[PDB]
């Protein structure tokens, strides 16, 4: 569990993966592909590129569509609990 105070445009990282758009063949997980410099994620350390996301305010992300994961990450107040 990595805690983050979301910033102006977001958590400060990008994602790929999800059912229908398998980042890795046969895998629907959501993976962190980029960490924006100076974003909240970066500054706070705990998360890095390549990490598999598990949950957001324990909405499990194990196997959901890419868009569901996006929304799940947009609709979580300034306070956020990660994986």
């Amino acid at each position: 569990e990595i805690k983050l105070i979301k910033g102006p445009k977001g958590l400060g990282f990008s994602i790929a993966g999800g059912v229908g758009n398998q980042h890795i063949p046969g895998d629907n997980s959501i993976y962190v592909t980029k960490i924006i410099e100076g974003g909240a994620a970066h500054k706070d350390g705990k998360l890095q590129i390549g990490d598999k996301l598990l949950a957001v305010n324990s909405v499990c992300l194990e196997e959901v569509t890419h868009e569901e994961a996006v929304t799940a990450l947009k609709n979580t107040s300034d306070f956020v609990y990660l994986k």
Binding site: K9, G10, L11, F13, S14, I15, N21, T33, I36
Partner: peptide, 6 residues
């Protein structure tokens, strides 16, 4: 192919 800024 979808990669998104969050």
């Amino acid at each position: 192919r979808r990669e998104t800024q969050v």
